[PDB]
């Protein structure tokens, strides 16, 4: 929005005269940039924790690859069927994606 409130602001920076440094006293953007970076975390080290705990129990790279090749497909597929028909496409669905992970 929001990526475009900055857009106009970006093009009017050069025509500015003496001493016009635009600051950011209050911005919401930071956290939505983080509410993705902190759930990629609880997804990557979920995957790392997935092909571990398999070396315990079943053992072997050649057998731990199978239950881990399935996890990208289900996750990638889930944020595809958000748009589908006439519904979602959001975060919190990406935050709550982790609880479904």
């Amino acid at each position: 929005t929001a990526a475009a409130i900055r857009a106009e602001l970006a093009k009017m920076e050069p025509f500015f005269p003496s001493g016009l440094k635009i600051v950011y006293p209050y911005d919401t953007t930071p956290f939505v940039k983080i509410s993705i970076h902190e759930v990629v975390k609880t997804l990557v080290e979920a995957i790392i924790l997935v092909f571990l705990v398999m070396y315990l129990f079943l053992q072997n790279f050649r057998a731990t690859l199978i239950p881990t090749i399935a996890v990208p497909v289900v996750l990638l597929g889930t944020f595809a069927v958000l748009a589908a028909f006439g519904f979602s496409i959001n975060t919190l669905t990406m935050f709550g994606m982790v609880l479904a992970i």
Binding site: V23, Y24, P25, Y26, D27, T28, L99
Partner: protein, 401 residues
């Protein structure tokens, strides 16, 4: 079931934002001079004894929520990163705590510093927002008394507690110039000429538009502040008559101090004052709203009651937690017989579920916390994923039968 009723619910939890804001408000018709004294006393705190947490203070004087005025003002706060403030003592959780303490500890005017409720608005958790309406068509003064009478009996209940306060309360003395219509008409002055004088010289007038170095801008005529600071300045304003000379005020006008409201509010075309309150440290909403329902019913005629906050409308956990698992249950119970058949399986699993729901209330209680809408999703995955542990041993076995 005991670990359940004792454990309170949770909406969407008050989560820190990396940014928060304060709330400044002044008494009976304070000046822009007096409120800046308070805003400077606030901008000071964040910049002096909180250098390691506060990035920026964007103090705005004359703003304030619930409406603008020369009596409000609020300041926005940017916080120093996220990693730059490690502990709980270092973030919004308790940053506001000493802020609320230090501001309210000693001050001539009230100051808060709330936390952003992690959304746009509406429905905190246990909150309420009452509204009292002029129904029969009584006076505003006759209404405000019933508002005070309700605030008198509500606060009279620290037993089954509540915390109730109104909005932009005031009713500040406003100066009324009483123009004598027949005294003015006698000495040659036009009524559509005195009111223009009194209006433009004290309030200001939008005359026309003018071009300023590229674009169209406004032309306001108001008059110097030197001659509009105090009631005595009304006199030294001169108005021209039909004779061709100047008749001043007071010779045709009357000067009186009188009470009036700076903020009149109306709910649904009817004059209605708003009251904001609480639940109690013990009970919540269901009773906090219920006792408030008839505190207004036990007072002056033509008063009524209404809610907007808050009071949903139609949602929450109640009505969206029993009928939820009713239509979940009818589904749950079914297809526990899809390839399993009969009422043989519908008890081998449909009530294996209260194993997961055990803690849960242990984790939710013995870890502080409270039952929220991720508990109301986790409590709901500890049902279905527990089935691949339950319906995948009744099927994993009984296929031996």
């Amino acid at each position: 079931a005991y670990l359940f009723v004792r454990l309170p619910s949770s909406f969407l939890p008050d989560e820190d934002q990396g940014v928060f804001m304060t709330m400044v408000q002044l008494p009976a018709g304070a000046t822009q001079e007096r409120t800046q004294k308070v805003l400077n006393e606030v901008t000071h705190y964040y910049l002096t004894k909180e250098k390691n947490n506060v990035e920026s203070v964007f103090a705005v004087n004359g703003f304030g929520f619930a409406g603008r005025g020369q009596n409000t003002g609020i300041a926005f706060v940017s916080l120093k990163d996220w990693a730059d403030r490690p502990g709980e003592e270092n973030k919004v959780e308790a940053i506001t705590m000493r802020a609320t303490r230090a501001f309210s500890q000693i001050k001539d005017a009230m100051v808060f510093a709330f936390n952003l409720p992690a959304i746009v608005e509406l429905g905190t958790a246990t909150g309420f927002d009452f509204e009292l309406i002029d129904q029969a068509g009584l006076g505003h003064e006759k209404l405000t008394q019933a508002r005070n009478q309700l605030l008198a009996e509500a606060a009279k209940h620290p037993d089954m507690l509540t915390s109730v306060r109104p909005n932009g309360l005031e009713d500040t003395p406003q100066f009324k110039i009483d123009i004598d219509q027949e005294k003015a008409q006698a000495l040659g002055v036009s009524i559509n000429d005195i009111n223009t004088t009194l209006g433009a010289a004290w309030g200001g007038s939008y005359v026309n538009d003018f071009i300023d170095r590229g674009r169209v801008k406004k032309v306001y005529v108001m008059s110097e502040a030197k001659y509009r600071m105090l009631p005595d300045d009304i006199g030294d304003w001169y108005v021209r008559a039909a004779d061709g000379q100047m008749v001043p005020f007071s010779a045709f006008s009357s000067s009186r101090w009188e009470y009036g409201s700076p903020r009149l509010e109306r709910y649904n075309g009817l004059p209605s004052m708003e009251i904001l309150g609480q639940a109690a440290p013990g009970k919540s909403t269901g009773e906090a709203m219920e006792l408030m329902e008839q505190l207004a019913s036990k007072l002056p005629t033509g008063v009524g009651y209404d809610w907007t906050g808050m009071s949903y409308q139609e949602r929450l956990s109640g009505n969206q937690a029993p009928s939820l698992y009713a239509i979940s249950l009818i589904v749950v119970f079914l297809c526990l017989a899809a390839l399993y058949e009969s009422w043989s399986i519908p008890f081998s699993v449909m009530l294996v579920v209260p194993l997961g729901v055990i803690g849960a209330l242990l984790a939710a209680t013995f870890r502080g916390l409270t039952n929220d809408v991720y508990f109301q999703v986790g409590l709901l995955t500890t049902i279905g994923l527990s089935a691949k542990n339950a319906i995948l041993i009744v099927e994993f076995a009984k296929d031996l039968m």
